[PDB]
C-alpha cells in the first residue's frame, strides 16, 4: 500500500482555471461528461477496486473514461449518457471541449429565435418556458 508517485501541486486536465481546494474524483463538475453512474459503469467494466489510498488519485481514470467516450458507438453501448442527443445539424454525437462553451450550447436558441416564436422570448428573458407559476411561489431565477 505504498505508491512511488509524488504529490503534485499543479495538475491540469481540460484547460480550465479553477481552484483546487477539496478532494478529487467526484468534484469533477468542471469536467462535463464524466461522473456518476456512467463513470461507475466504465470503471466496473475496467475491473479496478478500491484497495489503494484515497486523496492522492491521479487523472488516468478520467482520461480513460474520456477516451472510451470518444468512440462509444462501436460497442453498441446504450447511448443515453450524452448531453445533447438527436440534435439538429448532426445525427451523430460529435465531440466538443473548452470551458465557457458548453453553457451556450445547452440552449440552442438561434433557430427558435429566427422563426419568430414565443418560446424564444420565453427562454431569453430567463422566465418560465414550460410555465412554472411565479406569482406567489417561484420568485427565484434572478437571485
Amino acid at each position: 500500500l505504498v505508491i512511488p508517485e509524488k504529490f503534485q501541486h499543479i495538475l491540469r486536465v481540460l484547460n480550465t482555471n479553477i481552484d483546487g481546494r477539496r478532494k478529487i474524483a467526484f468534484a469533477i463538475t468542471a469536467i462535463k461528461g464524466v461522473g456518476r453512474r456512467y463513470a461507475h459503469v466504465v470503471l466496473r467494466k475496467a475491473d479496478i477496486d478500491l484497495t489503494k489510498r484515497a486523496g492522492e488519485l491521479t487523472e488516468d481514470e478520467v482520461e480513460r473514461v474520456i477516451t472510451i467516450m470518444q468512440n462509444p458507438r462501436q460497442y453498441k453501448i446504450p447511448d443515453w449518457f450524452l448531453n445533447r442527443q438527436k440534435d439538429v445539424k448532426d445525427g451523430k454525437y460529435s465531440q466538443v471541449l473548452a470551458n465557457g462553451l458548453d453553457n451556450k450550447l445547452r440552449e440552442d436558441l438561434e433557430r427558435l429565435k429566427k422563426i419568430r416564436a414565443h418560446r424564444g422570448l420565453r427562454h431569453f428573458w430567463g422566465l418560465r418556458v414550460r410555465g412554472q407559476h411565479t406569482k406567489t411561489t417561484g420568485r427565484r431565477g434572478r437571485t
Partner: protein
C-alpha cells in the same frame, strides 16, 4: 481552508512520520484526526498496514471507526 501537510513519500521524510503515532497516550484514528490534523483515513491505512505486518488482528469493519486489536 484545508491545511497543507507533507504527504510526499521520500527517502528521508517518509520514515519519520510513520513512527510518531504510538508515542501518544490515547492513540486512535479519531483522536489523531482531531489532534494531529490529518485525515483519519491515513490512520486507517496505517493500522491496516500494521495488520499486514502480522502484529494485530481484525475484528470488524466500519467506514468511520475500524476495529483492530491484539490479545497477547
Amino acid at each position: 481552508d484545508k491545511l497543507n501537510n507533507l504527504v510526499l513519500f521520500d527517502k528521508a521524510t517518509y520514515d519519520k512520520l510513520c513512527k510518531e503515532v504510538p508515542n501518544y497516550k490515547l492513540i486512535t484514528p479519531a483522536v489523531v484526526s482531531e489532534r494531529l490534523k490529518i485525515r483519519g483515513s491515513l490512520a486507517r491505512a496505517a493500522l491496516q498496514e500494521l495488520l499486514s505486518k502480522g502484529l494485530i488482528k481484525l475484528v470488524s469493519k466500519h467506514r468511520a471507526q475500524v476495529i483492530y486489536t491484539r490479545n497477547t
